[PDB]
Each structure stands twice: as structure tokens, then as C-alpha cells.
Write a protein that binds this ligand. Structure first.
Ligand code: FE
Lengths: 631, 630, 635
């Protein structure tokens, strides 16, 4: 009927006879295709009649290139002309040939041929020169990459929720997520993931991972892998690898050793180059070597495909001093097209930060350049990265900076890129806004949320009545949830505290306002809602389910109690029920206690107000205060 | 990439996944080797050198190149052997420009011509290659593989799915449609950052699936499908205006005798001056053709002249207008009809297809998944072909209405030529509360009648003189002696906003008021809420006020001096001109106010007077007096 | 040799995984071997083929390469060539071109060959020139006569006045703008490339500041300005930027005074050609009826440095470009062209951009500039003032014509830069600094400019900030005394007005205590004008303790900030009602009064007993006495 030579690429999800039968079928098809390729090559070489046309065959002799068919046609034509061609009047035919195409009569055939060839040779060389010059100009405009000369351009800020200097950063060319490291006090390092505008996404604490100076980030068949330098239970060095996940990770079965036998004799860290599929290693020489080699750090270039199994150092180079302390310690490392980029060094403050370039094969210093920024008109180094654009193949040298003293630590990425790379990186994600791009309220991330504290991105939001019903952390009990609210999520501090402001969407009722601090990393640390009184001249009613005034404990939130409603309250002053309207005031006290005031809404009669304190201190009695009517 | 040779020793997800991966890689490698061998056989120019080709005749083996050299050399020697004594001028001509002496004139001419022919072909090859590289870098346009890039959000004040959008290349205004109940559609105009400008309700317009937008001698025209009074299909044109429009004298019929036999809508291509029509088959026609829609390509000039001539026509197969894959977007560019389909839910992906309009063939079908960073499910919503006025560069715009159910947020994504997306993203920066330099934004009106007319979010400042005319100010005119900071904040998706007024005071308290406004109807505007804040300053009652009953703002205290107390006609009769007092204004029912006058006594006994007044009547003052203690 | 296993194990065993591993490795090796074999066949194999496998077909001949070679060799032998005369056979043979075509004559063959190559090379040359012309038009097109101006940024000085001029520093990206002031002064404000205010200089008796020449000399920026002396005489000078105030005298250097001080003289500096372009006025004695008011001189900046008087090119500006309805607003120069921007704000007539060829004096173009669009809501009819500038990019040498605008009216006055640039210039200028944000780009709190600041009023840029406990300790303008400084605070700096009043909001970072909130207005140009902090009460139900170091209730003066006093604590207050110490818990309320005075209420935290509250007023009015109010216990 038909027979498809196409392989089964969608397999059975269960190990069956069918799963085996699909694999055998594929291997049978592949075996036949391979046997056919082997037969085809042999047949091409030995039997195929018209393996090629003669036009596909080069014929070259003494600086002349033609093809076999055209040269055969040429030879046959030379024969045919000698047989068929008329014998001319020699001299007169030669005399006629002295006249060039413009009609100019040269003195000799050789003069004419010389003039013709020279005219075309000079012309074609002039066209070739213009081609090379236009191409050189085009390539310089588009692909110029000079880290020794170009001024770094600001790309973005990086906003982790950790107050520490940045060790390293890596921009994922596929997802555009930024992976950054920050050392933590207990020989741990924090690995934060950010959006390309620097906005925090999530994080991973690498427990006993050391300082996190740098990691190698490698994609393997659409899956991302992180190659990290760590420490075990005994604080001994280990070069391991693992896939990202949020939360925590420690040396054990959760991560894979690479080649422990050759790397764990020293501190071993690495960076991955996707262009050449190389894995560049930065290994610390043992303390005893620092006195003899005068080189505190060394770099070894190895292959990634070869790192998946075999041991082979392609090129090795010692990092001289002063490129590793005291006034110039290592702050950044990257690699591109046979050049090792090295960023030094501390600074705070006096001494400038330097970017160096070394030829990894010759070990020579190619350039040393001062790196300084003046756009926030001191500044300290924080990592290097080599960005390779997935769509265009274009590149940029990324320079990470951490600016300010201690508390005021802010991080930024600067770049030296090829044409359009910096503009692309700066504009992947617009900077964080309180609204959408058009100035409208941002959408909520959850429908009828269990926790309002789950809204962790700053912004102006709106919560409808039905979306407040499930809230477990709402400022008002469920009996009061009859309205829509404006929600403002504002920045807090550098470690995860944010502010949240709720305002009731009321035109004919007062705009109730509450504010709190939330800890986005632990809701148990969330602050209580602060009621901020504001009033438009409207009354506030008590929900009908409430029969005790003692249930009303929000400080500064008044209620109106009509004459009829006053009968419903079991804790209402006994001899003051069903006679007048009252304003209930709820005032401050100690934790577990409340102060309440009921003030009469009297018109011709004497003013009366009743005060009580109640809670853990006991159920206090009401005390009456009465005034004297005057004119 | 590389074949996985170390497989999982446990039959699980990774085993099946990497087993499938290997077979996909093997399939590609087999196809590549077959292509290489076929290309070697049929197309490679210089598949071989002649020295690799055996020439064997009488048990003597040579190669093709050396035998060709031998034959050519024989020929020339034969010519020299039958040339008499030659011609010296011809002998001289055997020497080429380098000084190399060839055997015959023919050998010299051959060599010269070949040298120049090979050289000029080498220059031509470099020209074509440099130009191909340049054109690929600058003008690559591949909707089948390029990843859509976020351009902007669209922010209408209509909470409905977007039907269509069009980016005006001259003004940069975005024209978007949203279907409304009652068979109307709303046409909203937005800034290129999505900010709402104004809108037009197209009464009995239908769903507003798409309009054709065309400039005719500097005048913008909108070609729409609309309904008449009898609910009959009318293909029309009209120019934009705000408010409302309906079928009649305000709309011009466009070839009614040709299009009004069915539902007809259009899109306009400015490059080829084509109007592309999407038309419906009637229920009876649908089963026979297995198609709901058909597309007609016509000249816009022919439309202007009223001449009926279908240049190219194509039926859309039902699978592209189905329950699972309904039409969500349509556009056209350089002989290709782009068709966007998708469902709102069910984990079925949305698709972008491209059809060759001339041959009717499907060129590509691709899943459109905005699995990016600006997204962190998708509801497909329109296509547009943006054509840059300055450069002629283009982009395929993809509209998305995202969000789980309600409320809807809209965004434009793009597949563009070099620099187009960067340009579109940055025409207008995203909305800010300040100007670009962090300063207060300018007010849209000087001495405004209504503060509610300030409808764009932002931080503003109103000078004393610009508060004088306000008809909706939180304080009466007697109190308008200061500048105020005005903050206009987002409210909800439908048009409610918040407004906050704060008095610019250094030596007086910073009075603060807040309200909700309805930007579409000021009658729905909320009352101003006073938010008390105090720096320790007193607040004076304007001299023009002689009744304490005029002071009704809750929480706003006033100080009354001994002399001032005499002026108030409603001051407790026996308490005038004897002391200073603090007037407190407290909460009550609507139409009523509570007031407290507390004495500013120093050595004498404290006194305070309370009253309630308004619709409940003019309540009497009640005195409360304390006992001096140590 | 090894073959693929096609009969696999029927159980997911170790044998199954191995057989699959073996096959994949064997497939990979076979494909590598096939690819090596094909590459070797193409490039190195000697006798890759026999000539019989290679097709030779031409017209009525169908053959293979080997048989055709045999045929040609055979033709050699049986060919009978005549002894046709001296050079006869050689000339005849030369008539055959490289394709094997036999021309009738040597001249015909040479004509054909030359013409073929001449036509071909001219075709290649035409494509080269066309590709280059297209490339240059795409990259370097600069047409102020037709290109549409693009919005770059707003400019945000702290001065309410029309902008006279602006200059974008290509090295620092700082924008230098001038605004005329009453009293014949001009304000020179420096801004970030997003328009954010940095600092300013008041050029006392500087005149209008119509335009300055900005020039770098050995890494030093110099400003060449028209200024006036004490006698209101015109002085052409230079000075380096400083903040504050400057006036004619020792701080300003005269620039060829004997040449330029006979009239009003202002300049612009072109860095490409190192030219100083002068705009000068004709004096009334030099003018007849409708004569021109202004003239422009082109001079070398080297000649200016050396004090050499040499006008390279001069041109009078026709009166129609310096009129009541078309007065001068902007001036710039580029590549032999003088750009002139005219406009009258209140007459509703249009604004124009003109280009003049400075050498020939001819008008090249006149176009209406209407920048009313999506970026200005679309306030085109309100274009109030304008300036021009030529931006020259340091990195690329690319350029842009910058068009400055002020859109009015009066108080609603706002400034913007629009541009007509070469490819990528506008995108570059728009994105040097992102527009001002309340947060960093990732939505986090912005860093503070000072550690443990003396004044919070020194934080003058809008934004959300955080101050740690230790950084509040030495604040001289904090809303609470030092005894209360035990917490971190959120600080919000908000815009105020156009002249420099900003708002500051402080909120206590409290989860288990109330979030104390204070707000004030600051004058960023004079802290003596700073307002007092307003306390905004908000309460989560927590009590507030009086620091143990405080023993006077009279020290607690913040209005609306309540404190709780325990029975034990009530004994330490020297101003507590004498007969009410150590008997109960109390809530202290602090209420409004006149400046210099405070009202305090002590309300008892009684449970079964009668409620009591005590009121007092104290301060400049005297130390008022406490008054007791007692209630009656009811059921
Ligand atoms: Fe071959």
C-alpha cells in the first residue's frame, strides 16, 4: 500500500512488547538506511554511470582554472575551426586586430592586447578594492568588539533580597533570567534568579557551598546545569554539578561529582563557553606553592564534551601577581575567543578597578585598563560575564558592579557589546512599574487569594468583593467583607519586607485604610494591619450577626448604633437600651484589652457618654458621664 | 547536538525522553548525510579535481587533467608545425602582460581571458555573498521561527476580550476593538504605551472582528462591517470621531451591490494598495465547501472606482475556523495570508498559520506560546502587519488577552525586522507618576472647574489661584489660601481612580483628603475623606464664617481665641469672650454633626461642651466641668 | 564487523539498556565514518572516479569524459593540416574563443571577448555602487527637511520659565540648559540625560542666555557666554562650570574683547570642524528701514584661542527670520549648514525650521515643525519656546539635530527634546538613563545617598528608601527624639512643586508595634524653610511605651500619639497628677492646641471601679493645672 521510512519518535510511556517492537522497528529502519548509505558510496565510486557531469570537474593548469566539459568543448572547437575555418590574408587580419573596441588603432597587435588586458585588469582591481573597503567598513560598524577601548554602557540594576556584595552573575541567553551569587556568613552562598530588569524571581541557598565566586552554566538538550565549587561535612573542597531548584541544597546525593579524583586536590571552580564548548577552570594552587610560583591562582582550559568523561588540560596558565591581592584581588573572570578576561580589585576606595586581558595560549597580557563609572554623580568591582545572543550570534562583555557602603549596596550590569547588543539587553523587560505600561491597575496573580501576602510584587491592584471572601489575612472579619478594595504593594527594605496598603472602594461610605509590613520569605513574621482613620462624614454600621459590642476591637473605627439596634447588644449599658442613637468609639489599650466609648446622639436632652475597658484585665464596668444643658 | 550514549538504568520519564531524543537526532543526521551525498552528485561545483579522475585507454593509465594538458599541448605544437615561418607581430603577441611567452597566440588569448573571467567572477561572488549577508541581518522576516517580543500592554477602560488592533504608522495611535452586548463594538484609541485616549461606540456594528484602516490623501478612513436597522450586513467606511456612530448618513456604503450579499470585513495593505476581504459562507454553503470563511484579494483603487474584480480568492478550511481552533486574528504580507487561531482554556495551544494566497497552500503552522519573562494562560487576540513609514521596515504584531478568567489584560508581541521592535517598544515610555526627570507632571487645565477632570495617574501641583474655581474642592472657598499636592492613583479596570489632595504647608498642618472618582461620570464621584495629620499647629476659622455649624469636616479641629469666640452666633451663650477653645468636629449620621468645644484653661477648671446638630434638629450644648487637682 | 542489534531483550534488563547503548554508539560511529569517507572522496581520493562515469554532453554529442578524450586524441592523428602560409594557421586558430566558438576573424574574436568582459565588469561595478548607496542611505541619512522628529526626553529644571537653550554633553551626557530670569539674569541648570535635575548656576547680569558655546579643551569643559558688566555693557566671555552664582568680573575670562564687545555677541561651538559660530546684532546706526538685525560669523576656535580676528564666512539673517511673527528661537550648525528655528507662541502662526548654506547664503529649506503628538497629549498648539543643538556621538561619530520645546501655558509649562537623527542615535539618546522611577529597575527600595545622615532633607531625589536604626541616630531633623530611635523606617520622597518643595514620608518598620507615620514638606534649596513633621495616626492595636529615660509627661508633645503608662511607671513622672501615682494604668492622649502649647489627657484603665480622666493644657500659656472628671459605675 505504502511503506514509510520514518522513525517512531513518539514512544509508548510503558515498557511493553509495543515499546520493544517500536525500538526494534527503528533499529531495523536505521540498519537498512546505513547499509544503503554504504552501498551508495561504493556504487558512486565504482559503478554509477554519470556519477557527475564534466562541469563539476575542475581542470586547472598553470594558473588557469576551467571545468572538464567546457575544456573538452574548447578543444573540439579548436579542431573544428582548423578543419572548417578559412585561411585569411595573414598580415591584413593582424592589422585589423590592432583596432580596439573604441575604434583606436594601436601600432601593433601586442600593444592592442596589452592595452585591453591592462584596462580591464585596472578596472576590476578598482572594483575589488571598493568591495573589500565597503565590507571592512560594514564589519567594523557591526562586529567591533574592543574591551580595551569601548566605554561600558549601563544595562540594568540587579535586585536580590540579600544585602551582600555580588560575587558573580550570568545572563541566560535562552530565558533571559539572571543567575547571581552572594556569599553568606556560614560559608554558604545565595543563588538568586532575577528577571532581565533585575526583579527578584526566586532563590536557592547553597549550604556549605563556600563563597560562590563563580559557577559554570551549561544547557544540555534543553536542560540547564550549574557546575559549582563546594565543601562537604569536613569542609574539604568538592567540584560538583546540579540543576536549579528553589530553597536549599547541600553536598550529598542532591548534586553530582564531576571528576573528584583530579579536581578535589585543590579549590576548583569553572565557567562555560558555549561557542567553543569549552570549560575554563580557576583552581587555587596549594598554600605551599604561593611562595615558590608567586602565582596565587591558575587557569586551565579543557573541553566540555571531554569533561563529560575524560581528563585532558588543553592549555594552562598561571595568574601572576598583583592580579590576586593585596590592592588588586580577583573580582571577575570570563573568556571569549582565546582571551581570558580578569577583573581586579579592592578598592574600597583610593586604587582604581582594572580589567585585564590575557592570551590564554601565549600567557601574555594584551591590555590593562581602568574601569570607572560616573552616571550617579567610590565604586567597586563585581564579576564578569560573556553574553552570546541566541538570535544573532552577537556578543557582549558584561561587567557587574556593586556600589555604595554596607547598607546602601546596589548592583548593576554594564556592558561592552557589538552593535545593537546593549540596546537589546536594556530593553528585554521594561523597568518595574506600579502600573501596567498604560497606567492601569496591574492584574492580581491569584483569584480569591488565601493570602494577600502572596501578592509580593510592588504595584497598584484591585480586589473585588468576591476576591476578599477567602482571605485568611484580611484586616476585617468576614462579616464586614461587602466591598472592593484598592491594594498597594510598596517596597520595604533590602531583605524581603514589603508594605501593603488596603483602601475600601467607597463613595457613599468612608474609605477605610489599613497598612502592614509583610515578610515575603516568612508570613509568620507578618505585621498586624494598622487602621488609619479617614472620614467623609458617613456612618458605619455593625453587621447584624454581632450581638456583643466586645467583638468590635479595631482602634479608631467608629460605629453608629440606632435606637432599635441598641436593644440587640447584650453588653449595652442595661438602663440605656432602646432610648437613643449612639456613636461607639473604640480606643487604644494594652494587648488583650480594649477601651470603648458610647456617646449619645441627643438633641434637646443632656449629653451622656459611657466609658469601659475590657479584655484580659477583666470585663470592666461602664461608667456614665452626664452634662448640663446650657443656652 | 550529541547522541546520549549513557542511558538511565531505570525505565522512567528520562529513559523514554532521551530514547525519543536519540531517534530524532539520528533522523536528522541520516537526512543530512543523504542531502550531502545528493548535493555532491548533482550540484557541487568542483565535486572533484581532474587529477582524481582516471583516464585509461590502451592499458596505460593517466588522469583527466594531465591528459587534457597533453591534448592541448599537442594541438599547439601541430599549429606551430604548420605555420611556415610565422608572423613576427603574431610571435610578439604570444607574450602576455606578465612577460610569460605562450606557445601560440591562441594560448595567450585563452590564458588572458580566463584570468580576467575567473577574477571578475570571484569579485561578483563576493558582492552577492556580502549583499546576501547584509540583507539577512537587516531584513530577515520569519514568522515561522522568530520568537515574539513584548512591545506594550493595551489599557482600554472596557473589560472585554480584544477583537483586533491596528497601530497607526503616522500618528502611532493604537485602534482597538472590543465587542459589547447589544451587538455593538467599542473602538478605543490608545497611545503607543497602551494609555487610553478616547473611544467610539459603533452601534449595531456587530463584533468588530476587524476593520481596514487606510489613509487617503492625509485622511484616515475606517472600513467596517456594520448592521442596518433590519440587522442586514453593510460594508461601509467612516472617519473616526469620539462618542457614538450608527449605520446611516454618518457612514458611507462601499460597493453595497457587491458585498452586502454576505458578512464582509476587510484589512488594508498599504505596500501593494490591496484590500483583503474576509467573507462568510451561509449555513447552506458551509457543508458543501467545508469552510465558514473565504478571503478575497482586491485592489484599493478598484474599490475606490467601484469596479468588481477579485484578484485572488481562497477558502479557509473548517479546521482553521473550528470549536477548538476558532479564528482570532488575520493579517497579510507579501503574498502570505496570516491566520491566528485558538481557544480560551482547554490546554490546546494557540496557532499561527501562513498560507500562500496565490497557490492556497499552507506554508507553516506554529504554536504561539508566550513562555517569556514579561508574561510571568494566553487568549489569542488579533494580528496586525506594522509597516514603518520612515524605513519601510515591517513587523507581524500578535495581540494577546492574558489572565485566568477575569480581569483581562492585553499585550502586543511582535516578530519584526531589525530595529522595528526596539522602535515600537520605545515610541512612548511606559506611564509614570512623574515626568521623565522625576518632577511633578503638568496639569491639563488651568484653574480647573473640576479636579475630577484630571484623569491621568500622576503627581501634580495646584497653585492657590488654580484652586479658586474648583467646584469639587474638599474645602469651601474661604479656606483656599494655599497650594496643594494632587496625586491621581489607579482605582480599578473600569474607570474608578483615587485622588489625594495634601496642603502645601510648612507652618500649618498638612491637610489631607482622599476620594474615588468615576472618570466616565462625575455624578458617581465619592465625597472627600479627611485624613487627620498634625504637626502641632493651630487651624483658624476664616473671618467670613460666624456659625460653628458651618464646620462639618470630621477630625479637622480649629482654634478659637477669646476675641474670636464673640463672633459666633451659635457659641454657648454664657461662654463668649472669656477663653480660648479647641473646636472638635466628630462623626455622626448623614445630615448630622457632633461638635466639642474644649477650653484652653490653664489655672482654672477644665470645661468642655458637646452638641449634635443637623437633620435631627439643632441640638443644645451640654457642659461638662472638671475639678482642679495638684 | 559490528551490526545493529535488531532482536532486543524482551525484559527491561541491563542487557536491554546495553543493546540500546551499543546501537546508538554504533550508529554515531557509522555516520562519522560515512561523513569522513565522503569528505575524503571529495578532497583527497585519487581515482575518486573513472572518466566513463563523468558525463560529457554538448549539442549533438552525447558521451563520457574518457571516450571523448579518446575521440579527440584520434582526431589529432587523422587530421590533415596544410602548410597554409606564414602565421596563417596560428591566426586562424586564434579566432577560437574560450567557449570553443570559431569567429570569422581575429578582430571579431577580440571584439567579442573585450565587449563580454567590459559589459560584465560594468554590471559588477553598478551592483557595488548600488549596494553601497543603499547601505549609506540606511545608516547615515540625515534630512532635517523631511524626517519626523522623535521624542527623546523631558527636561526637569527647578525654575518656572521658558527654556532658551540646551546642550547635550557628548562625554558626560549631562544636559546644560538656560532659562532667562527677571533682573536680566539667566539660570544655567545641569540635568541627567532623562531630564533629572543635578545642580544649577545663576549667571547674574548674564542677560537672556539665548545660547552658549560648550567646548572641551584638554579634558576641560569651557562655557562661552554673552554677559553684561555692572554698566550693562556687552561682554563676550568664557568660564568653567560651578554651582551657585557667577557674575562678570575675576571669575569670567574676556574673549577677544576688542573684537566682540562693540555689540551683543553669542556663540555655539562645532566640534567636528573646530569652529566657533557667532550670532551677533547689528546696531541701530548700522541699519536702514527694513535691514537685518542679526548676522552670523564662522570663525576657527584655534584663531579665537590665539586672539586672531578672521571671519571665515559671514551671513546676514533676513528680517523675516528675526521678526515679530517669526522671532529667532533656535540656532545650530552642521556640515556647512546654518539651522534656524523661528516661532511666536501666542500668534497661532506656525514654527519653522530653516536651513541656510553658510557659504552661498541661500535658503535650502523651510519647513513647519509640529511636534504635537502622543508624547505631549497632543499639545502642539501650545509650543511656547524652542532651541536647537547638534548632537555628535563620541563612540560612533553619528549625529542628530536636537529640537527643544517648551509646551505651555504658564504654570503647566514643561520642556522636551525631540530629534532628527542618523540610524540608532535617537534610540541611544532615549535610553542612556531610564526615566526616573521610585524604585531601582527591579522594584527594590533605592539606595540612600548618605550613611547616618545629619539631615534627612539631604535626600532630595524622589523614591522609596529604607533607613536602618543605626542610620537614624545622628539625624538633626528626625520626627522623634533620640530616646525613641530603636527601629528601621521606610522613607518616601515624593514630588512637590515646580520650584523645589518635595514631600517626605517616614513610616516605622514595625510588625509588633504600630506603624508610626510622619509627613513634611522640604525646600531642597533652603532647609531653613523646611516644614514640621505631621504625625498621621494609625493603630494595629499595640500599646506604645514611653522610653525609661523620660520622666516628664510635658516632653510628649506629638499630637495623636498615645502612650500607655503602667501602675509602676506612673510613679516616675514628676508632672503626673499628685494623688493619682502608683494606683492604676493609664492611657496618655496628646491633643491639638496653639503653637507652643499642648493638651494632654490621662484616662484610667479601670475595670470594676469608676472611670476617671484628667485634662491639662501647658506651654507658653503657662503650666496649666490638671482637672479631674469622674464617672458613675452603671450596670
Ligand atoms: Fe564523486
Amino acid at each position: 500500500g505504502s511503506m514509510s521510512n520514518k522513525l517512531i519518535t513518539d514512544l509508548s510511556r510503558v515498557f511493553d512488547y509495543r515499546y520493544v517492537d517500536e525500538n526494534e522497528y527503528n533499529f531495523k529502519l536505521i540498519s537498512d538506511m546505513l547499509t544503503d548509505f554504504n552501498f551508495s558510496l561504493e556504487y558512486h565510486r565504482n559503478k554509477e554511470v554519470f556519477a557527475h557531469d564534466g562541469e563539476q570537474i575542475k581542470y586547472e593548469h598553470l594558473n588557469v582554472t576551467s571545468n572538464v566539459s567546457d575544456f573538452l568543448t574548447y578543444l573540439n572547437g579548436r579542431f573544428s575551426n582548423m578543419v572548417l575555418g578559412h585561411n585569411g590574408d595573414g598580415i591584413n587580419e593582424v592589422k585589423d586586430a590592432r583596432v580596439d573596441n573604441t575604434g583606436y588603432g594601436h601600432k601593433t597587435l601586442q600593444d592592442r592586447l596589452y592595452h585591453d588586458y591592462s584596462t580591464l585588469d585596472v578596472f576590476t582591481k578598482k572594483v575589488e578594492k571598493a568591495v573589500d573597503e565597503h565590507y571592512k567598513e560594514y564589519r567594523a560598524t557591526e562586529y567591533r568588539f574592543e574591551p580595551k577601548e569601548q566605554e561600558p554602557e549601563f544595562i540594568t540594576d540587579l535586585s536580590p533580597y540579600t544585602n551582600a556584595v555580588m560575587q558573580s552573575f550570568w545572563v541566560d541567553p535562552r530565558t533571559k533570567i539572571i543567575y547571581m551569587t552572594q556569599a553568606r556568613p556560614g560559608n554558604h552562598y545565595m543563588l538568586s534568579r532575577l528577571k532581565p530588569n533585575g526583579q527578584f524571581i526566586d532563590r536557592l541557598l547553597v549550604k556549605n557551598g563556600g563563597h560562590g565566586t563563580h559557577n559554570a552554566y551549561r544547557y544540555i538538550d534543553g536542560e540547564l546545569w550549574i557546575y559549582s565549587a563546594v565543601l562537604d561535612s569536613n569542609k574539604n573542597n568538592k567540584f560538583v554539578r546540579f540543576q536549579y531548584r528553589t530553597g536549599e541544597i547541600t553536598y550529598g546525593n542532591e548534586m553530582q561529582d564531576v571528576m573528584p579524583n583530579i579536581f578535589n586536590d585543590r579549590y576548583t571552580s569553572a565557567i562555560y563557553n558555549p561557542v567553543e564548548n569549552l570549560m575554563i577552570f580557576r583552581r587555587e594552587y596549594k598554600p605551599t606553592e604561593r611562595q615558590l610560583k608567586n602565582s596565587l591562582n591558575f587557569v586551565e582550559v579543557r573541553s566540555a564534551d571531554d569533561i563529560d568523561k575524560i581528563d585532558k588540560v588543553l592549555y594552562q596558565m598561571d595568574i601572576p601577581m598583583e592580579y590576586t591581592s593585596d590592592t588588586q584581588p580577583m573580582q571577575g573572570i570570563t573568556y571569549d575567543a582565546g582571551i581570558l578576561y580578569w577583573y581586579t580589585g579592592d578598592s574600597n576606595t583610593a586604587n582604581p578597578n582594572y580589567l585585564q586581558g590575557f592570551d590564554i595560549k601565549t600567557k601574555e597580557l594584551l591590555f590593562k585598563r581602568r574601569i570607572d563609572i560616573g552616571g550617579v554623580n567610590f565604586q567597586e568591582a563585581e564579576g564578569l560575564d560573556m553574553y552570546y545572543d541566541l538570535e544573532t550570534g552577537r556578543k557582549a562583555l558584561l561587567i557587574g558592579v556593586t556600589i555604595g557602603p554596607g547598607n546602601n549596596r546596589h548592583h548593576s550590569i554594564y556592558s561592552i557589546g557589538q552593535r545593537g547588543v546593549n540596546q537589546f539587553l536594556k530593553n528585554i523587560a521594561p523597568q518595574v512599574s506600579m502600573t501596567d505600561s498604560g497606567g492601569r491597575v496591574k492584574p492580581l496573580p491569584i483569584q480569591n487569594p488565601a493570602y494577600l501576602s502572596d501578592i509580593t510584587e510592588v504595584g497598584h491592584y484591585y480586589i473585588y468583593t468576591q476576591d476578599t471572601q477567602n482571605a485568611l489575612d484580611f484586616p476585617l472579619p468576614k462579616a464586614f467583607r461587602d466591598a472592593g478594595w484598592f491594594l498597594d504593594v510598596l517596597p520595604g527594605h533590602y531583605n524581603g519586607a514589603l508594605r501593603q496598603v488596603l483602601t475600601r472602594n467607597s463613595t457613599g461610605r468612608n474609605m477605610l485604610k489599613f497598612e502592614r509590613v509583610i515578610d515575603i520569605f516568612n508570613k509568620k513574621n507578618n505585621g498586624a494591619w494598622n487602621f488609619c482613620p479617614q472620614n467623609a462624614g458617613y456612618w458605619e454600621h455593625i453587621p447584624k450577626s454581632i450581638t456583643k459590642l466586645s467583638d468590635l476591637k479595631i482602634v479608631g473605627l467608629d460605629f453608629y448604633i440606632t435606637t432599635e439596634e441598641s436593644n440587640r447588644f447584650t453588653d449595652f449599658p442595661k438602663d440605656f437600651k432602646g432610648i437613643a442613637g449612639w456613636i461607639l468609639e473604640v480606643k487604644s489599650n494594652t494587648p488583650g484589652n480594649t477601651t470603648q466609648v458610647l456617646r449619645r446622639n441627643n438633641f434637646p436632652s443632656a449629653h451622656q457618654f459611657l466609658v469601659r475597658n475590657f479584655g484580659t484585665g477583666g470585663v470592666g464596668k461602664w461608667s456614665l458621664f452626664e452634662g448640663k444643658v446650657v443656652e
